[PDB]
Write a protein that binds this ligand. Structure first.
Ligand code: Q8S
Length: 300
């Protein structure tokens, strides 16, 4: 019916806005990125600080885990992405080619490719082993806000401030489909059939991408400025989860679109949220008046 998320830990350490939080696929870790140029690794269940990973020359907008939880990829204002060995903290590769800030990144399920989006309006596809750029897609006419592979890796979805969401064939780089307020976030649904898209008019929408039809709309939060992540919560009740510019985490019922919970505690915009892969745990993180990450746990 409704979850009962409750604050369990607050994680301090970043010295500027947090930009992204992500749980490792094996559930053990939370990774956070920040405008302070750092990645921090934390225990997913107790919030225990594990390590700082450093090397970018400017702030980081996004981080993403490989499928085996051993690698991380980061997107930076220094125009590069970096591939990191999480166990050693070492930079394995620096991915060079974007001509402006890199805003978003993800591995494919195989974790042999990375996709990135940039203020330079392109999407790039990179080889993980060599660190070389394989394709540059002239994807958008304004900064690219999000990029994500689907569940078999054959598709990429991208979104942009130009108002478009596009689906790309990974193998060829060619556009399969296009779907205008700025689109600030997109990702494929767990079952691969839907795309969840945020627009800077305080709206989330669930699209059937095959049919090109909007199936659900979620509102009541505040999102007119920032690229705020949204999530599917797959461990307990079927929820949509998002931060908000009124400093709250919002949780909706996937099917009824009703708000089922709002989490209070942050003291700045909640720019990022993540849902744990096996436990009913949310991580949230806020902009520079707050700079903390919060871990929330529910019984359902
Ligand atoms: C009931 C249902 N399941 C899906 N699949 S899903 O979006 O991928 C998905 C979301 C979540 Br939260 C958790 C899990 Cl486990 C999932 O599989 C869609 N819908 C309804 C049908 C019409 C659109 C909403």
């Amino acid at each position: 019916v409704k979850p009962n998320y409750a604050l369990k830990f607050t994680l301090a350490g970043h010295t500027k806005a947090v930009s992204s939080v992500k749980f490792s696929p094996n559930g053990e870790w939370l990774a956070s990125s920040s405008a302070d140029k750092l990645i921090k690794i934390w225990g997913a269940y107790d919030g225990k600080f594990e390590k700082t990973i450093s090397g970018h020359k400017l702030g980081i907008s996004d981080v993403a885990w490989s499928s085996d939880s051993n690698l991380l990829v980061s997107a930076s204002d220094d125009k590069t992405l970096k591939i990191w060995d999480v166990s050693s903290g070492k930079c394995l590769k620096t991915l060079k080619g974007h001509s402006n800030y890199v805003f978003c990144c993800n591995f494919n399920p195989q974790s042999n490719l990375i996709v990135s989006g940039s203020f330079d309006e392109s999407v790039r596809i990179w080889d993980v082993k060599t660190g070389k750029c394989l394709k540059t897609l002239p994807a958008h006419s304004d900064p690219v806000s999000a990029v994500h592979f689907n569940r078999d890796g054959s598709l990429i979805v991208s979104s942009s401030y130009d108002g478009l969401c596009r689906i790309w064939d990974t193998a060829s780089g060619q556009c399969l489909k296009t779907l205008n307020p700025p689109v600030s976030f997109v990702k494929f649904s767990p079952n691969g059939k839907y795309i969840l898209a945020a627009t800077l008019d305080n709206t989330l929408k669930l699209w059937d991408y095959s049919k090109g039809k909007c199936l659900k709309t979620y509102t009541g939060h505040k999102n007119e400025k920032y690229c705020i992540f949204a999530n599917f919560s797959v461990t307990g009740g079927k929820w949509i989860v998002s931060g908000s510019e009124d400093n709250l985490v919002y949780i909706w019922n996937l099917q009824t679109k009703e708000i089922v919970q709002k989490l209070q505690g942050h003291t700045d915009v909640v720019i990022s949220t993540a849902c744990h892969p096996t436990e009913n745990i949310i991580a949230s993180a806020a902009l520079e008046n707050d700079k903390t990450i919060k871990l929330w746990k529910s019984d359902c």
